[PDB]
Amino acid sequence: APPTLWSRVTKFGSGWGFWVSPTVFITTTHVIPTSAKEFFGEPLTSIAIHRAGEFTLFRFSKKIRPDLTGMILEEGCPEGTVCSVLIKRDSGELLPLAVRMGAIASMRIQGRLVHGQSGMLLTGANAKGMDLGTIPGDCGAPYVYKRANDWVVCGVHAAATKSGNTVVCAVQ
Amino acid sequence: PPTLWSRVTKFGSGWGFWVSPTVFITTTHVIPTSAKEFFGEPLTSIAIHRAGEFTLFRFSKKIRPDLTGMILEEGCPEGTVCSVLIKRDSGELLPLAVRMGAIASMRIQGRLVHGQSGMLLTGANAKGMDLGTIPGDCGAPYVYKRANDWVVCGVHAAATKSGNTVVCAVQA
Ligand SMILES: CS(=O)(=O)NCCc1ccccc1
């Protein structure tokens, strides 16, 4: 995946978030530190929060990341799209996990109720564990895909099943 | 904490894989043709076992004493979904699902390559996103999970321009 997309993935709370533009940051609601009153040097005062279940978007009144260009955020993707989940791991290692996207779904995962766009990992037979699959600390990682010329972001990592094969993308 | 990715190592014009502290496997065509040492050990002290596009090195001391010995087998049953553990010079780790077929001699781009056929589960077109192999990927290992055990069953030897087809070179 392009270096400019990896540059947009920021360590955040118990996971990650993603810079859509110099002013827009998206993440998974449950990774956000519940006590936090300041983000990227800005008071809560100065920030527009948009929360829809496990999807959260932050809009800043200042350019926090002026090195970036604004890219397309969409509300999930067509069923059958193959996406990459941009997961950073121990060592400066970069894991762009391939996922075939399915329907919008409501599930119970480890007792918690989750809603988003479901998908199946294309990494192995059974993706249980950290070599072929996701771990809890990957939540908030972006789902991206390429069109003709364009790259698109369509959601953030919310959950995965015990077997590790099924994932859920939180969407706008 | 141990990872299979730790055992994937840059080597000649491609990659190889540590099976054990003393055992390293790779694809014959990526090995340098001028060398007096590998991994600091004189070539005098290394057993080389070659069978077409599969080569095994056995060193006279532990090069990777941090590792345990893994199961190495001559290919896998047809229908097994393997993962090819691709490392890229970008720093990306790209595990891709491959459905394994028969042993055969296959015409790939110019040439005749003997080993176990497979097809990528990404099988749209696998060139433009991180969804297929490139020439520099040769030597990457084919692995799968069986009961509690990881098995390694060959090394990446060849791929078609693209429809979906790959060849895993195997021990014999
Ligand atoms: C939050 S900060 O004060 O340490 N820096 C602001 C700019 C920035 C934000 C996110 C990622 C990289 C840089």
Numbering used by the authors:
A (entry chain A): 1 to 172
B (entry chain B): 2 to 173
Article sentences:
The 3C-like protease (3CLpro) was named because of its similarity to the picornavirus 3C protease. It is a cysteine protease which shows a typical chymotrypsin-like fold containing two domains: a β-barrel domain and a β-sheet domain separated by a groove where the active site is located. The active site is characterised by a catalytic dyad (Cys139-His30) or triad (Cys139-His30-Glu54) and shows a strong preference for a –D/E-F/Y-X-L-Q-G-P- (X can be H, Q, or E) sequence corresponding to the subsites S5-S4-S3-S2-S1-S1′-S2′.
Screening with the DSPL library and part of the Maybridge Ro3 library identified 19 ligands in total which bind in five different sites, as illustrated in Fig. 2.
